[PDB]
Structure 1
């Protein structure tokens, strides 16, 4: 078995190897990359996502989210308070202000220390889940707006034709902006490209150990756990690396820098934070190996997690028994 310790692998494809997305994903998994739940892909030195980022300030962040934390430094929830719309220009200016900017620090490790020590005492503002793309339409390789769609994958593998579309989302982050512990909708893959700015640190639990994370989360967030059998789908819970180590949860960590891709694999729980002003683009995707994960994925039926138009059809076809009660939570 490849990668038995489930370490995060880092790939350096050639421009030749970067031409066929599906085949490179299949390659990574032949080397055991999926066992970690997360891989990094450094694009060939000749590749670019677009020529410059000079004109992005006019993107609108229609609903910035102020991420308000409750709990203790290593175990907290966050609630997203909706703020007034602002442009990316305005946001970047806000991220760079004295109140919100990245503090002085020695290196990534010192900054990680400061994040976990001090996160709860500040409420950074996140521009998340904005439909759109920053890839140039002439970028042909690893263009997150030109991937084959999950609906087409399900059609090719399973023969069923469904409604729905699959498009990317932009995330504008600042220091301390946080993504809580989650897997993807329907335990899909994700791919994330860091277009510009400061890094993003990731924590990940190997898919084969995901249930151990869930068991800890039920113990750490006991009221949430009673309210919904899949409350991690709410994307509100944070657990520090220190806490994970204390409870023997297997995990890994890695820092993504501008110009790099990350791929999360089915049922790879991940969480993380932003080091400073940045912009990432991400999208979900599927492969043939995903299908069984999609069949077994948990669902939020309490009605908090409230998920896309396209997810309906995945639940309808892959989880027909759930379909009934799940759409009660989604209606």
Structure 2
């Protein structure tokens, strides 16, 4: 069995190996990469996502989200308070202001220590979940707006044609902006490209151990757990590395830098934070190996998780017993 300790693997494809996206995912899996839940892919030196980032300031962040925490430093939830619209140039200036800018630090480990010590005492503003792409149309390799769609994969594997579309999302971050512990919708893969700016630190639980994280979360967030049998689908709970280690939960960590891709694998729980002003692009995708995870994915039916149009068909076809209850949650 490849990668039996479930370590995060880092790949360096050549320009020739970068042509065929599906083939390279399957290669990484042949080497055991999925067992970690997360892999890093450094593009060949010949590749670029676009020519420059000099002209992005007029993108609009229609609903910036202020991330307000509650709890203790290592065990907390966050809620998202909606703020007035601002442009990417306005948000970058805000991120760089004395109130929001990254503090002085020695290295990534010192900054990580400061994040976990101090996150809860501040409310950073995240420009998350913005439909769109920064890949040039002429970039043919690993262009997250040109991937094979999840609806086409379901149709190729299972024969059933379904409605829905699959497009990328932009994330504009600042110091301390946070992504809570989650797996993807329907335990899909995700791919994330960090276009510019400061790093993103990731934490991940191997898929084979995801239920250990769920049991810890039910203990640490006991009211939330009574409210919903899949409350991590709400994407609000944070648990620090120190707390995970104290409770014996297997995990790994890695920092992504500008110019690098990360792939999350089906049922790989992940969480993390941004180091300073940045911009990432991400999208969900599927492969044949996903289908079995989709069939078994938990679902929130309490009403909180509220998701895209295109998840309807995935539930309806892969989980017909759950469909009626889940759809009530959506309505």
Question: What TM bracket, shorter-length normalisation?
Answer: over 0.9
**Distance in 2, Cα, partners of 1:184 & 1:278:** 22
Structure 2 equivalent of residue 133 of structure 1: 133
The offset of 1:277, in angstroms, is 0.1
Task: Provide Cα deviations, 1:220-277, integer angstroms capped at 9, x if missing partner.
Answer: 0000000000000000000000000000000000000000000000000000000000
Task: Provide Cα deviations, 1:285-319, integer angstroms capped at 9, x if missing partner.
Answer: 00000000000000000010000000000000000
**Distance in 1, Cα, partners of 2:313 & 2:57:** 36
Task: Provide Cα deviations, 1:170-196, integer angstroms capped at 9, x if missing partner.
Answer: 000000000000000000000000000
Runs of 4+ with >6 A deviation: none
**Distance in 1, Cα, partners of 2:31 & 2:243:** 30
- Aligned: 1:61 with 2:51: no
The offset of 1:122, in angstroms, is 0.2
The offset of 1:23, in angstroms, is 0.1
The offset of 1:54, in angstroms, is 0.5
Structure 1 equivalent of residue 149 of structure 2: 149
- Aligned: 1:216 with 2:216: yes
- Aligned: 1:309 with 2:309: yes
The offset of 1:13, in angstroms, is 0.1
Structure 2 equivalent of residue 100 of structure 1: 100
Q: Secondary structure at the match of 1:17?
A: coil
The offset of 1:143, in angstroms, is 0.1
**Distance in 2, Cα, partners of 1:258 & 1:157:** 35
TM-score (norm 2): 1.00
**Distance in 2, Cα, partners of 1:231 & 1:87:** 33
**Distance in 2, Cα, partners of 1:106 & 1:133:** 33
The offset of 1:202, in angstroms, is 0.0
- Aligned: 1:225 with 2:225: yes
**Distance in 1, Cα, partners of 2:205 & 2:103:** 28
Q: Secondary structure at the match of 1:309?
A: coil
The offset of 1:39, in angstroms, is 0.1
Structure 1 equivalent of residue 123 of structure 2: 123
**Distance in 2, Cα, partners of 1:322 & 1:130:** 29
**Distance in 1, Cα, partners of 2:318 & 2:93:** 45
**Distance in 1, Cα, partners of 2:230 & 2:61:** 29
Structure 2 unmatched runs, 5+: none
Q: Secondary structure at the match of 2:120?
A: helix
Task: Provide Cα deviations, 1:78-113, integer angstroms capped at 9, x if missing partner.
Answer: 000000000000000000000000000000000000
Alignment root-mean-square deviation, CA: 0.2
Task: Provide Cα deviations, 1:26-74, integer angstroms capped at 9, x if missing partner.
Answer: 0000000000000000000000000000000000000000000000000
